[PDB]
RNA sequence: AAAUAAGCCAUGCGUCUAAGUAUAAGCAAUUAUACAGCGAAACUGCGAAUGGCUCAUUAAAUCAGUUAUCGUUUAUUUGAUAGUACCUUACUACAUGGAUAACCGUGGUAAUUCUAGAGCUAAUACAUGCUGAAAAUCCCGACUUCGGAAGGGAUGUAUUUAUUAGAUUAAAAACCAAUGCCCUUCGGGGCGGUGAUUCAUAAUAACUUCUCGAAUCGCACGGCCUUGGCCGGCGAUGGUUCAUUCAAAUUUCUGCCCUAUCAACUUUCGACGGCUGGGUAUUGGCCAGCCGUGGUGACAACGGGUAAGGGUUAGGGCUCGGAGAAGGAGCCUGAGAAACGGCUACUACAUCCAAGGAAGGGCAGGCGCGCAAAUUACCCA
């Protein structure tokens, strides 16, 4: 009460001591209710600081008064800015040495309390109340402010704060009157979650049954069904437990904790963040197991007591998550894939590696909107670690399927380090098998990653067999797609591709006439179709080279300078009208090449060739083709005459087509 | 006599003009507030629309933003270091906007050792630019004033960090 | 205290009401787009004779304007305010004519219950809530999320909520409430943007007269759908 | 050049005849010029 | 001098540039997109907003600290002669350093808030022409 | 129904509704007595940015059309509007304070509320303002019988500053070549606003000698029945923010009459910028520090002369259109004034007096020779 505080301060000043004498004006303004926040920063950080000679005289009086001002409910507003910032602005400016007397006036009956004895739990203390459930709430809010304002400097005051917070916590955990005990529980758990990473060197081993009674009794048999919505204070506590190296031995006391924590990951109706939170708890556990000599005191305990009997259920939950739902967040995907990345060099034997390899190749045949390429490189590292377990010999259809994926990601990636690790996962593939052949592919792609002289050496050595050839074809079309370092790489890749298709036309035996011909369709022909739109003229030249080699060597396959350029275009005109053509060839190879011919009598000759080909393609392609050309009209104001000449030629071809089809 | 009209000055073509009209209350401009360092002396001015603006003439403390970490604290104001406009404000210690002034560092130091825990100025996310670390070892940081003290009644602002900190150290050396 | 000739030409006064004219008090509708209640009662309808008689009508709760009792005499009632008199059992509505003047329309409760108001602006108010401002300065909290600017709304007038809305459309018939072609009920057939200020629409009547009016001066009344009874 | 910074020596009109010169000096003008010679140098 | 800055953008973080489009069918030049000058009366860097009138014309004097004067010519109708006469006016506009400046060119300006006693306009588009000195005439 | 003066001379001159405060020692009463009806005095709220007078003038600066406020203030209007508890007083608190006016008395002085002393008493005047209660209120919701919910997070507003979000992804290496892919009967089927903003808005961290979140008045008086209450309606007054209206302030292009016995002008109160701040309701050389070299002009700047129209279209008519309150100088109120309504000092007139002191600064009318000529009219209907 402000009036009783004023009269009490008047009596304290009636005690006439020279320690209080120079500070009376600074004292009374704290009880004047309009100047409290200004008088606080007049007292501390002022020219009239408290002198350390009579600091011993003023500080008990001042701290009783500041305590009363922190208690008083009248002048304070609502919300946080009402009185929460007042408590914070007192405690943030108080010294850590005065804070002992501050908590001494804070804890009245709980000053000399003992929670733990030589035995486990003091039930005689716990079956009694010294404070009202109204009164413990302000205590816990104050100690939360004290800890959040102190930080490490709690180290000289460890022996009483933890007894207070533990007493209020276990009285709440016995009382599960609901609301006050519930808020007592939640704010005490927040205070403890701060206090743990406040104090690393304090000894937490004389009590373990208290964490047991705080955890295993109310929650754990229902904990994922509860935590399906949002992160809680128990999870906030287990997080800094997983972060601290001496607190991870609290998770071993009940064996079923980590089962329920990954069962939370198993429940699919969770709102993504409790999932990534449990995922982060697991990240911290595996990082602590991988840490050096500091965490090696309990490394063996977490290795042999926590993760080793629950590897199987961990992989089962991650498998159900990755194969179950149709909608997976990118944050959960990247974080869980990073957990499997860090968890793979921890397991030596396990049970569900067949499943996990099939999961990795499923997530690598996933598209690019669902899975990032950085995430694909992390699943590559997953492949690199999981492949060396002796598993691919049985279930050989799985092993051919993952080899289809390792080959498929060679032309996909654009990063040197990812291609290095790709060469490594193919190396341990080769160590696990056929074996000489995959080792030959290994040395080939190895000196492909290797710099320009070793690269051309690789190209020449490969220049000098189906599953042998397929990864070389994928990385070879990638080495087509590079424009130039000196221009030599695309030429060498084109010559190697010519060697490959020469081997294909060398094999015309019928059960391989199925396989090699399906390969040279599905891998090589859309590669040439997509590389037709490449703006580099040397890349267009080399794709022209391999396509001319294909037409010259193949033909039994059913699906197949200025003046010389004009001459070849006229011969292509005549060849068109003599033989109409294949429509997908016309749509996806010749038109963008001639478009590039225009946009780098060449232009009119090009429009003549497109006006020839528009008769030979089909209207369903022509619809979107014409729409792309009007898109060129509206998007390109740079060559209006050229695009409109092209349009006039195409509509003359349109009227020709309709007049023929009548 | 202090006003805001343009009737006394010459035109764009270089001509003066008579154009004599009396000074009006919407051309009103009041006398400047040289906000200095002292205890709090603020006078409240009522203005058009009945709206109050707080003319602060002597100020002690304001809150300053160490916002790269996420805090702002109320600290006192020691003395103005440099001012980009005038030298007389540097001489007579006048708090205006865009004034670089040195402030106390104790609540920022307290919040650093309270949140992170590694002490400062006496793992990897707690990281301090070594120039700013020298300011913390001095116990007196170089803040800059972003609030108008005359037309709001408080001298608040953000702390200098990085390139602006080095720029105003070089300008102090100038 | 303006003179009878300086009063605008669309709330009519004859050679009778003295040389002076009442000014409208400040309110929802504008000054020059306004009919005061005294001009509506004693100069248009002639239910009264004098200022004191108009006061003796207004002060007792006998005249309700937009469903609420309006006490003061010079209360502004510009456009489409339903005016309910219960002792006579009539509800009048204010529309325009083809020449550009105010027109009164007698009607009963079924068409008297709703008001067709043109949206002035849509915004996000305090509390993070979208709100809607009409030309009657009615703000509606939580509107329908397609009702954009220059759309008209059927306001309930017993709760004030939205009931229906008509979109700004090239092919929806409209009413002109300003400009040199004021008061011409016709169909919006074209709309030109003119970004940089003062865009226009091109509008034709039922009988082929094209003219360009500004999108501020337009006012949507219905595609065919005469939701208020224009007088036959 | 600018606002006031150069001493424009102009005879000011209302500033012209403010104060009369009032010689209030209790010393007799013959001892004073002998004083300013015999400072720290002499 | 003080360190120039874009007024609310947090540069000193240990964990960009604000350029708005003026609109009105205009394109931001590459110097206004990335060029490291800082000017607060620039409509692409500072907070100055263009609205209202949109004018054109030919520069008289480029040689000035980011302010150009435009001679605007028009044909006035004198009724005493019943004839058209040439009348020249001089505008002032603040110049961003984003564009490449020439003398005698035809420049597009836009209306903004008053930036000085004369300056009410900013440059938005420059048409590089071979226009000559004061002897040259064209209504524009 | 038309009807020079300079100088003399007299006379003439706010605000109350059922709805803030009534113990008038004020009137008028009775069938349940704090008050009840009428209600002077006084406190409280509103009002006087004008009705209209005088006279050295204002030469695209006003003004007119024509823009803009993404550069600003707005009482009143009318419309929406405010989720903000707990948080060590508990061995507590739970019908909130004190002032004054009117009034009653005792007076002083030549001098009217010019006022002194003494005693009261109210507020929608000024002012504080944890509490019945173990709950309250927002966002999520597992499980689900529409069941309605186990249990998880969280605790306004105004100012000022820093920061983040202002919206599908940024390894954006995506979406765009759906020019496909599959089935099929070959017909087919399936796969916030703006032109624009750092705008509006939301959040974190704090900050304020900082506000608001109703301790008010009138009228009806109904449901649940713990018959001890708990709920309840219509208004008046008041309140934060956003509107809207009424304004005000700037601001963009064009348009004045004549003149070269006016060709240089500005920098002679900075003249043109840009940077930084101050002040303003806001922009702005508007003002202060730093520097750069300008700006206008024979296409008529500048100076000089003083003789100071627009819209409505048969027509005429009709409509709209700077400086002072005895003289400079400074201040006060209010949403709006540099009110001239007040104050202060100086200057200049002038009045009463008991000679100590004290209040105050207009127009209209008649004469203007000794001889002359339109009412000192009545009412807000």
Q: Locate C15 and state its tokens.
A: 């050679």
Number of Cβ within a 10 Å radius of residue A118: 5
Span between the terminal Cα atoms of chain E, in Å? 41
CA atoms of A504 and A498, how far apart (whole Å): 10
- Dihedrals φ, ψ of B61, to 5°? -125, 155
Six-digit token string for A25: 């004006």
Q: Which two tokens stand for residue B75?
A: 């600290």
The Å distance, CA of E54 to C1' of F165, is: 35
Report chain C residues whose CB lies below 8 A from the CB of E54: 196
CB atoms within 10 A of CB B19: 10
- Asked if E54 and E111 touch (Cβ cutoff 8 Å), the reply is yes
Q: How many angstroms separate the CA atoms of B18 and C22, rounded?
A: 42
Distance CA C3, CA C23 (A): 10
Q: How far apart are CA A261 and CA A232, in angstroms?
A: 13
CA distance E127 to C123: 40
Cα of B117 vs its chain's centroid, Å: 31
User: Would you call A38 and B110 a contact, using CB atoms and an 8 Å cutoff?
Assistant: no
* A154 HSE (CA, 13 A, CB side): 29
Pairwise CA distance, residues B64 & A206, whole Å: 44
C-beta within 7 A of nucleic chain F, residues 51-70 of E: 51-53, 55, 60-61, 63-67, 69
CA distance C42 to C40: 6
Strand order across the C162-166 sheet: C139-141, C129-134, C115-125, C152-155, C162-166
In the structure encoding, which two tokens stand for residue D35, read together? 């004083």
Q: Rounded to an integer, what distance in angstroms lies between the CA atom of residue C57 and that of residue C41?
A: 9
Nearest to A330 by CA among A366, A278, A384, A284: A366
CA distance A499 to A460: 11
d(CA C108, CA A64): 76
Cβ distance C105 to C91 under 8 Å? no
Q: Are C212 and C188 in contact (CB under 8 A)?
A: no
Collapsed DSSP state (helix, strand, coil) of residue A90: helix
Token digits for A267? 């429940």
Give yes or no for CB of A394 within 7 Å of strand F: no
Give the number of residues written for chain E.
140
Which ranges in A450-524 belong to alpha helices (H)?
452-463, 466-481, 488-506, 510-519
* β C83-85/C63-65 pair status: antiparallel
Q: For the purposes of burial, counting CB atoms within 10 Å of the CB of C85, is it exposed (0-12), middle (13-18) or buried (19 or more)?
A: middle
CA distance E52 to chain C (A): 7
> A149 and B114 in contact by Cβ < 8 A?
yes
Distance CA A336, CA A279 (A): 7
Using what technique was this structure determined? cryo-EM
Each residue of E20-30: b (16+ CB within 10 Å) or e? Answer: eebeeeeeebe
CA C7 to mean position of chain CA atoms: 19
Contact list in E for residue B6 (CB cut-off 8 A) is: 117
- Residue among C90, C1, C6, C3 nearest C40 (CA): C90
What torsion do the CA atoms of C138, C144, C146, C151 make, to the nearest 10 degrees? -30
Residues with Cβ within 8 Å of A476's Cβ and at least 6 positions away in sequence, in order, are: A493, A496, A497, A500
**Chain E residue nearest residue B5, CA to CA:** E117
Question: Which residues of chain E are within 8 Å of residue C199 when distances are taken between CB atoms?
Answer: none
Question: CB–CB of A135/A156 below 8 Å?
Answer: no
Q: After which residues is chain A broken (C to N over 2.5 A)?
A: 176, 433, 450, 464, 560, 600
- Kind of pairing, strands C173-176 and C218-222? antiparallel
Token pair belonging to A234: 């128990």
Residue B105 makes CB contacts below 8 A (sequence gap 6+) with: B75, B121, B135, B136, B138, B139, B140, B141
Buried b / exposed e along E119-136 (16+ C-beta atoms within 10 A): bbbbbbbbeeeebeeeee
Residue with tokens 């000759």: A605
Contact A257, A251 (CB under 8 A): yes
A389 DSSP 8-state letter: S
Q: Considering only CB atoms, which residues of chain C are within 8 Å of chain E?
A: 195-197
Transcribe A331-371 into DSSP letters: HHHHHHHHHHHHHTTT-SS-S-HHHHHHHHHHHHHS-TTTS
Nearest-5° angle of CA A88, CA A94, CA A96? 115
Q: Are strands C129-134 and C173-176 parallel, antiparallel or unpaired?
A: unpaired
Q: What is the DSSP string of B14-61?
A: S----------TTSB-------EESS-EEEEEEETTTEEEEEEEEE-E
Residue B70's closest CA among B116, B106, B104? B116
Closest residue by Cα to residue A111 from A102, A119, A120 = A102
Which among B9, B127, B163 has the least Cβ separation from residue E11? B163
Sign of CA dihedral A478, A480, A485, A489: positive
- Contact residues for B27 (Cβ-Cβ < 8 A; gap 6+): B3, B4, B5
Contact B64, B157 (CB under 8 A): yes
What whole-number distance in Å separates Cα of residue A146 and Cα of residue A143? 5
* Measured distance CA(E22)–CA(C78) in Å, rounded: 39
- C77 contacts C122 by C-beta, under 8 angstroms: no
Strand partners, E58: E71, E106
Note whether A74 and A2 are within 8 A (CB). Answer: yes
Cross-chain CB nearest to E3 (options B9, B12, B164): B164
Q: Which residues pair with C117 in a beta bridge?
A: C153
In the numeric block, the tokens 């100069």 are attached to C43
C194: alpha, beta or left? (left if phi > 0; alpha if psi -120 to 50) = left
Contact positions of strand F to protein Cβ (< 7 A)? 58-59, 61, 67-71, 73-82, 84-91, 128-130, 134-136, 140-143, 150-164, 169-175, 177-180, 192-198, 200-202, 204-213, 241-255, 258, 265-290, 292-303, 318-320, 322-324, 329-330, 333-339
Nucleotide F234 C1' to residue A522 CA (A): 83
Residue C51, CA distances (Å) to A597, C37, C43 in order: 88, 11, 11
For B85-121, what is the HEC assignment? Answer: CCCHHHHCCECCCCCEEEEECHHHHHHHHHHCCCCCC
B: neighbours with 3+ CB pairs under 8 Å?
A: A, E
Question: Whole-angstrom Cα distance, residue C182 to residue C118?
Answer: 17
Three-state DSSP string of B75-93: EEEEEEEECCCCCHHHHCC
C149 Cβ contact list (under 8 Å, min separation 6): C119, C120, C121, C122, C168
Q: Does an H or E element contain A41, and which?
A: helix A36-43
> Is residue C34 a contact partner of residue C11, using CB atoms and an 8 Å limit?
yes
Instruction: Give the C-alpha separation, A516 to A509, whole Å.
Output: 10
Q: What's the CA gap between A559 and A589, in Å, rounded? A: 14
Minimal CA–CA distance to C50: which of C73, C27, C75? C73
Dihedral sign of CA atoms B139, B142, B147, B148 in order:
positive
- With contacts defined as CB-CB under 8 Å, which chain C residues touch E52? 197
Which resolution, in Å, applies to this structure?
Answer: 7.1
- By DSSP bridging, strand B157-159 and strand B61-66 are parallel
SS3 A15: coil
Cα angle value B123/B129/B135 (rounded, 5°): 115
Task: Quote the DSSP letter at residue C184.
Answer: -
């Amino acid at each position: 009460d402000i009036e009783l505080q004023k009269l009490a301060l008047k009596a304290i000043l009636t005690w006439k001591s020279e320690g209080i004498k120079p500070y009376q004006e600074h004292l009374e303004y704290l009880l004047d209710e309009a100047r409290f926040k200004n008088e606080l920063t007049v007292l501390f950080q002022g020219d009239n600081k408290i002198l350390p000679e009579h600091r011993s005289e003023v500080i008990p009086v001042l701290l009783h008064l500041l305590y009363g001002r922190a208690i008083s409910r009248k002048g304070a507003a609502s919300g946080r800015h009402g009185l929460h910032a007042t408590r914070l602005a007192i405690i943030r400016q108080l010294d850590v040495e005065d804070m002992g007397s501050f908590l001494d006036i804070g804890l009245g009956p709980l000053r000399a309390i003992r929670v733990v004895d030589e035995q486990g739990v003091r039930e005689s203390v716990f079956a009694h109340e010294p404070l009202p459930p109204r009164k413990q709430v302000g205590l816990l809010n104050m100690l939360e402010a004290v800890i959040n304002e102190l930080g490490t400097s709690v180290e000289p005051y460890m022996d009483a704060l933890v007894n207070s917070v533990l007493y209020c916590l276990v009285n709440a955990c016995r009382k599960l009157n609901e609301s006050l005990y519930r808020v007592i529980r939640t704010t005490a758990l927040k205070s403890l979650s701060r206090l743990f990473q406040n104090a690393p060197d304090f000894n937490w081993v004389p009590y373990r049954e208290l964490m047991v009674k705080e955890i295993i009794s109310p929650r754990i048999e229902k904990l994922p069904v509860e935590s399906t919505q949002g992160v809680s204070a128990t999870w906030r506590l287990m997080a800094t437990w997983s972060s601290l190296p001496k607190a991870a031995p609290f998770l071993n006391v009940d064996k079923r904790i980590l089962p329920k924590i990954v069962e939370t990951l198993s429940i699919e109706k969770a709102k993504d963040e409790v999932k990534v939170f449990a995922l982060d708890i697991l990240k911290n556990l595996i990082n602590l197991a991988q840490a050096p000599e500091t965490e090696s005191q309990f490394n063996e305990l977490i290795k042999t007591e926590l993760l080793d009997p629950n590897t199987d259920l961990i992989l089962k939950t991650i498998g159900g998550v990755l194969h179950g739902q149709s909608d997976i967040g990118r944050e959960l995907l990247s974080s869980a894939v990073d957990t499997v990345v860090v968890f793979a060099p921890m397991i030596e034997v396990s049970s569900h590696i067949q499943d996990m390899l099939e999961i990795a190749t499923w997530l690598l045949n996933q598209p690019l909107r669902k899975v990032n390429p950085k995430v694909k490189g992390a699943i590559l590292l997953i492949l690199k670690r999981f492949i060396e377990l002796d598993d691919l010999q049985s279930n050989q259809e799985l092993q051919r399927k993952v080899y289809s994926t390792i080959s498929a990601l060679f032309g996909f990636f654009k990063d040197k380090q990812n291609r290095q690790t790709l060469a490594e996962v193919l190396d341990v593939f080769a160590r696990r098998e056929w074996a000489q052949e995959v080792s030959d592919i290994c040395r080939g792609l190895n000196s492909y990653v290797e710099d320009y002289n070793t690269r051309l050496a690789a190209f020449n050595s490969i220049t000098k067999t189906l599953d042998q050839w397929m990864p070389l074809v994928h990385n070879l079309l990638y080495f087509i797609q590079q424009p130039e370092e000196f221009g030599v790489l695309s030429s060498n890749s084109a010559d190697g591709l010519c060697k490959f298709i020469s081997a294909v036309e060398s094999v015309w035996a019928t059960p391989d006439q199925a396989a090699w011909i399906d390969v040279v369709a599905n891998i090589i022909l859309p590669a040439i179709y997509a590389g037709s739109r490449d703006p580099s003229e040397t890349v267009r030249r080399e794709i022209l080279r391999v396509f001319g080699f294909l037409v010259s060597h193949l033909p039994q396959w059913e699906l197949v300078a200025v003046s010389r350029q004009l001459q070849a275009l006229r011969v292509l005109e005549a060849a068109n009208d003599k033989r109409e053509f294949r429509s997908k060839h016309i749509s996806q190879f010749f038109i963008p090449l001639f478009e590039h011919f225009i946009f780098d009598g060449l232009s009119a000759q090009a429009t003549n060739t497109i006006a020839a080909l528009t008769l030979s393609l089909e209207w369903q392609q022509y619809r979107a083709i014409l729409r792309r050309f009007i898109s060129y009209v509206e998007s390109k104001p740079d060559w209006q005459k050229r695009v409109v000449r092209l349009l006039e030629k195409e509509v003359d071809a349109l009227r020709t087509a309709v007049a023929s089809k009548k | 006599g202090i006003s805001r009209d343009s009737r006394h000055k010459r035109s764009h073509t270089g001509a003066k003009r008579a154009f004599y009209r009396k000074k009006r209350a919407f051309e009103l401009g009041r006398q400047p507030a040289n906000t200095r360092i002292g205890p709090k002396r603020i006078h409240i001015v009522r203005t058009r629309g009945g709206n109050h603006k707080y003319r602060a003439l002597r100020l002690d403390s304001g809150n300053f933003a160490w916002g790269s970490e996420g805090c702002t604290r109320k600290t006192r104001i020691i003395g103005v270091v440099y001012h980009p406009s005038n030298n007389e404000l540097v001489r007579t210690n006048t708090l205006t906007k865009s004034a670089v002034v040195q402030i106390d560092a104790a609540p920022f130091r307290q919040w650093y050792e309270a949140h992170y825990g590694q002490p400062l100025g006496r793992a990897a996310h707690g990281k301090v630019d070594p120039a700013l670390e020298k300011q913390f070892e001095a116990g007196r940081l170089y803040a800059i004033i972003s609030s108008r003290p005359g037309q709001s009644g408080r001298a608040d602002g953000y702390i200098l960090e990085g390139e602006e900190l080095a720029f105003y150290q070089r300008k102090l050396h100038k | 205290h303006q003179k009878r000739l300086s009063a605008p030409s669309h709330w009519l006064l004859d050679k009778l009401s003295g040389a002076y004219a009442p000014r409208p008090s400040t309110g929802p509708h504008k000054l020059r787009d306004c009919m005061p209640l005294i001009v509506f009662v004693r100069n248009r309808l002639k239910y009264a004779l004098n200022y004191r008689e108009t006061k003796a009508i207004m002060m007792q709760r006998l005249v309700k304007v937009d469903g609420k009792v309006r006490t003061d005499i010079t209360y502004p009632a510009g456009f489409m305010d339903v005016i309910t008199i219960e002792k006579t059992g009539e509800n009048f509505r204010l529309i325009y004519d083809t020449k550009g003047r105010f027109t009164v329309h007698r009607i009963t409760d079924e068409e008297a219950k709703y008001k067709l108001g043109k949206v002035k602006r849509v915004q996000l108010g305090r509390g993070g809530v979208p709100f809607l401002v009409t030309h009657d300065a009615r703000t509606i909290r939580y509107p329908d999320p397609l009702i954009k600017v220059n759309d008209t709304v059927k306001i309930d007038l017993e709760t004030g909520k939205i009931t229906d809305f008509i979109k700004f459309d090239t092919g929806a018939l409209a009413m002109i409430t300003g400009g040199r072609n004021m008061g011409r009920v016709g169909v919006i057939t074209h709309r030109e943007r003119h970004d940089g200020g003062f865009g226009i629409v091109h509008l034709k009547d039922a009988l082929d007269n094209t003219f360009a009016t500004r999108e501020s001066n337009v006012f949507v009344i219905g595609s065919e759908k005469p939701w208020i009874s224009l007088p036959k | 050049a600018s606002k006031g910074r150069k001493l424009r020596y102009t005879v000011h009109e209302k500033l012209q005849n403010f104060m009369a010169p009032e010689d209030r000096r209790s010393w007799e003008e013959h001892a004073i010029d002998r004083l300013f010679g015999t400072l720290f140098g002499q | 001098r003080a360190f120039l800055k874009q007024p609310h953008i947090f540069l000193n973080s240990k964990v960009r540039r604000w350029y708005k489009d003026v609109g009105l069918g205009f394109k931001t030049p590459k110097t206004a997109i990335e060029g490291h000058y800082i000017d607060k009366k620039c409509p692409f860097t500072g907070m100055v907003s263009i609205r209202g009138r949109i004018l054109t014309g030919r520069v008289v004097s480029t040689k000035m600290h980011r302010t150009i004067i435009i001679r605007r010519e028009y044909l006035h109708y004198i009724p005493k002669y019943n004839r058209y006469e040439k009348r020249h006016k001089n505008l002032a506009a603040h110049v961003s350093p984003a564009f490449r400046v020439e003398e005698g060119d035809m420049v597009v300006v836009g209306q903004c808030r008053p930036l000085s006693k004369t300056v009410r306009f900013n440059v938005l588009r420059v048409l590089p022409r071979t226009g000559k000195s004061v002897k040259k005439f064209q209504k524009f």
